[PDB]
């Protein structure tokens, strides 16, 4: 029952910075292995027996520790180093993994481009109405989205989804969908998508009149 605690649980770094993740056990361990896992794939062996780099990992990585505390270090951060890093104990039973650390790649601020899409005739035929809004390519993940029908806010029938940090530009995208019955829909005239992001002091809005 050796529990391995990882600090920090999440963090971001600009390229060029030095990063140091730590793994700590409840009792002395002979060594720790480290794995790296990019979203949507199987983990890779990164560092074996505390300091031996596995195959293909660049020289910016290094490990060390003994007893209960071990750590991983990157001399200078680089975009492709973004992923989750797990530390693993195997000098006992059962074998245990660490909580995990998600490393994000920082970048200069970028504001989202908004787009509002009314329901389609086909869906209306069926009698339902989904209005979609795309908040694309903004950096700081924190963003707030609200919907207004004829000036009134509505937080019911709202479904949101977020993409993973983009590989080519390190940015983010978000989608917001509001589903109503054709009745509720044709019983109003204005629909507004409103986002509040740090790149602006006032909320950004996009709207269409039915």
């Amino acid at each position: 029952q050796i529990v391995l605690t990882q600090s920090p649980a999440i963090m971001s770094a600009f390229p060029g910075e030095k990063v140091t993740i730590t793994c700590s056990a409840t009792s002395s361990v002979n060594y720790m292995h480290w794995f790296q896992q990019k979203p949507g794939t199987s983990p890779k062996l990164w560092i074996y027996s505390s300091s031996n780099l596995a195959s293909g990992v660049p020289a910016r990585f290094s490990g060390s520790g003994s007893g209960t505390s071990y750590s991983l270090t990157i001399s200078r951060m680089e975009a492709e180093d973004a992923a989750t890093y797990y530390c693993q104990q195997r000098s006992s039973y059962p074998i245990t993994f660490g909580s995990g650390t998600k490393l994000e790649i920082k970048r200069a601020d970028a504001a989202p481009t908004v787009s509002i899409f009314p329901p389609s005739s086909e869906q209306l035929t069926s009698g339902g109405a989904s209005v979609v809004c795309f908040l694309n390519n903004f950096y700081p993940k924190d963003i707030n989205v609200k919907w207004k029908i004829d000036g009134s806010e509505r937080q019911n029938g709202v479904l949101n989804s977020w993409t993973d940090q983009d590989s080519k530009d390190s940015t983010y995208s978000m989608s917001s969908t509001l589903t109503l019955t054709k009745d509720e829909y044709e019983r109003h005239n204005s629909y507004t998508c409103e986002a509040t992001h740090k790149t602006s002091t006032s909320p950004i809005v996009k709207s269409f009149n039915r």
């Binding site: 060594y31 292995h33 199987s42 983990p43 890779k44 062996l45 074996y48 027996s49 031996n52 596995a54 797990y86 195997r90 039973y93 059962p94 074998i95 245990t96 993994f97 660490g98 909580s99 995990g100 481009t113 908004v114 787009s115 509002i116 899409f117 009314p118 389609s120 086909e122 869906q123 989904s130 979609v132 795309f134 694309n136 479904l159 949101n160 989804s161 977020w162 993409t163 995208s173 978000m174 989608s175 969908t177 996009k206 269409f208």
Partner: protein, 219 residues
């Protein structure tokens, strides 16, 4: 030297059971232990157990004693794991991993196999074309969309123009609308590209041999 093949996605009803395989494709199969690890959505890794094919020995993580049972076909160098009395907690992605000597580092891992324990029935999706409302989009010229509504097994393939159009796309993770899923994708093209040319979202849902095509026609 190195390649492991796991099974395709599974959907089992609660109470049921599954048998999944991992195939050794290029090394001394009965010379190393095979490990099975579990990972729940957006969560961490957990060690199940290992088996040494050669002499069929095995070690099990306590937590998974009655639930797990490991086996392997030496003739075909394949590992097998069966789960029992499946519940909502058993929904996760499972991995097979090969151990080595001394350090005992799991060098190569399998691609992973997804398991869903549910009572919902397989439903097909609905593909609606999202045409823009002149001006409702900001820069980068023009942005189009494609909404995919109401399907149950999570796998869905979405592409633009059969693949010819890959730059400037964004497909968003799927969300669960009470028993069903919804997904959406966008493509930002240049102004002189759209009506002049053609954009079509292609969607196909494997669990129901459905293949829809929606041409984005302007309003």
């Amino acid at each position: 030297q190195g390649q492991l093949q796991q099974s395709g996605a599974e959907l089992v009803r609660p109470g049921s059971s599954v048998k999944i395989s991992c195939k050794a494709s290029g090394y001394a199969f009965s010379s190393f232990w095979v490990n099975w690890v579990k990972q729940r959505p957006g969560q961490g890794l957990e060690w199940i157990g290992q088996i040494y094919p050669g002499d069929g020995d095995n070690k099990y993580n306590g937590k998974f004693k009655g639930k797990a049972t490991l086996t392997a076909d030496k003739s075909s160098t394949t590992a097998y794991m069966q789960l029992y009395s499946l519940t909502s907690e058993d929904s996760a992605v499972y991995f097979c991993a090969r151990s080595g000597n001394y350090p005992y580092a799991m060098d190569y891992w399998g691609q992973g196999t997804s398991v869903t324990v549910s009572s919902a029935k397989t439903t097909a999706p609905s593909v609606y074309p999202l045409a823009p409302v002149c001006g409702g989009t900001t820069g980068s010229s023009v942005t189009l969309g494609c909404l995919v509504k109401g399907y149950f097994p999570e796998p869905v393939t979405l592409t633009w123009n059969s693949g010819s159009l890959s730059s400037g796309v964004h497909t968003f993770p799927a969300v669960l609308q009470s028993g069903l899923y919804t997904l959406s994708s966008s493509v930002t093209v240049t102004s002189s590209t759209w009506p002049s040319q053609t954009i079509t979202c292609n969607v196909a849902h494997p669990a129901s041999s459905t293949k829809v095509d929606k041409k984005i026609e302007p309003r």
